[PDB]
Design a protein around this ligand. Structure first.
Ligand SMILES: O=C(NNC(=O)C(F)F)c1cnc(NCc2ccccc2)nc1
Ligand SMILES: [K+]
Ligand SMILES: [K+]
Ligand SMILES: [Zn+2]
Length: 356
């Protein structure tokens, strides 16, 4: 019963040279690492090394053009870097960005390999830049390559092509990239909870609504749980897991669970406006550990309050290590709109999931 942990300080070299206080800070990953140290969680984990993804690995989800453009930024002067970054929605680029993104992806491949070969039971990946907004052909929302989507394909590449991978994306934003990449795929079940506001929240697309259930062979294998009109917190997320995430996941019977674990739904986050607590995140993790024979990989996505994300992700790792869930606060009655969101998803997915 071993928990893997990957962290490599080289991943802080990706930085914003015009706005050094941009919220996607290098010290996001070092602060999470430090909090694992001072909670004495780090020494309880088995350290998994980082590595670069290869270009061939990137091609599992991304076009050759996009790979070549981000790759070319390593040798760019600042004027090129600022101009290229401005070609995307919410991207900054430095000469180190490409390498950091390769390290983020490769760190997760190694963690997935360790899980799948039984060297560890589960694992946590403290990586940046994040991934779930990255599309097949473009960068977006602080993400260059879709680390979680790539890890699901990497996992299938070292097992069998049809390995059932569940991606739970509890970052406060919709994983537009992850949805698109697997939208026609029934071997990767994508479940995202996100602040939506009828499309008035980044990434600002109706693709995130509950009626997008997947396409072609993938119909039923895309589950959007969109939040509207309400500062959601632990009661709402517990309810979504009880009514939607856990029943669908158990029916799917994944062989590997990837968490796109953004922590910007956390209490205190400057962008998300939500109030999921560190103990809420522990319970969400503890619940996901009842799937896939405990084979869970927690991948850092967003989350921008350094104290909030450090405590929040440390508590997830505590659950991975087998610690008992901390007690939740008395769960207030669900915001009315949250009940409406859950009922809309239930109606959308009852046709495909008999457990609903
Ligand atoms: O937090 C986000 N996405 N969630 C993730 O996990 C990500 F890290 F992969 C996010 C992405 N883009 C934006 N654009 C707007 C804006 C840019 C700069 C500052 C403040 C706002 N916003 C929020
Ligand atoms: K999400
Ligand atoms: K899918
Ligand atoms: Zn986010």
């Amino acid at each position: 019963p071993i928990t893997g942990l990957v962290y490599d300080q080289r991943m802080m070299l990706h930085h914003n040279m015009w706005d050094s206080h941009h919220p996607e800070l290098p010290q996001r990953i070092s602060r999470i690492f430090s909090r694992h140290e001072e909670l004495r969680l780090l020494s309880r984990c088995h350290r998994i090394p980082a590595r670069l993804a290869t270009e061939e690995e990137l091609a599992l989800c991304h076009s050759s053009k996009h790979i070549s453009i981000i790759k070319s930024s390593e040798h760019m002067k600042p004027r090129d870097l600022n101009r290229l970054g401005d070609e995307y929605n919410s991207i900054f680029i430095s000469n180190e960005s490409y390498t950091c993104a390769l390290l983020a992806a490769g760190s997760c491949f190694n963690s997935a390999q360790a899980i799948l070969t039984g060297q560890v039971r589960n694992a946590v990946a403290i990586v940046r830049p994040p991934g779930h907004h990255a599309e097949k052909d473009t960068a977006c929302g602080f993400c260059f390559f879709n680390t979680a989507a790539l890890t699901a394909r990497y996992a299938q590449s070292i097992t069998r092509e049809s390995l059932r991978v569940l991606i739970v994306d509890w970052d406060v934003h919709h994983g537009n990239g992850t949805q698109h990449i697997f939208e026609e795929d029934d071997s990767v079940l994508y479940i995202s909870l996100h602040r939506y506001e009828d499309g008035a929240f980044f990434p600002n697309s109706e693709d995130a609504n509950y009626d997008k259930v997947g396409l072609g062979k993938g119909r039923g294998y895309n589950v959007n749980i969109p939040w509207n009109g309400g500062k959601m917190g632990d009661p709402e997320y517990m309810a979504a897991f009880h009514h939607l995430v856990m029943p669908i996941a158990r029916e799917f019977a994944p062989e590997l669970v990837l968490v796109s674990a953004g922590f910007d739904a956390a209490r205190g986050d400057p962008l998300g406006g939500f109030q999921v607590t560190p103990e809420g995140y522990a319970h969400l993790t503890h619940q996901l550990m009842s799937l896939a024979a405990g084979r869970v990989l927690i991948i850092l996505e967003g989350g921008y309050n350094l104290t909030s994300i450090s405590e929040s992700m440390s508590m997830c790792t505590s659950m991975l290590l087998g610690d008992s869930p901390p007690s939740l606060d008395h769960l207030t009655p669900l915001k009315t709109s949250a009940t409406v969101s859950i009922n809309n998803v239930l109606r959308a997915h009852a046709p495909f999931w008999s457990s609903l």
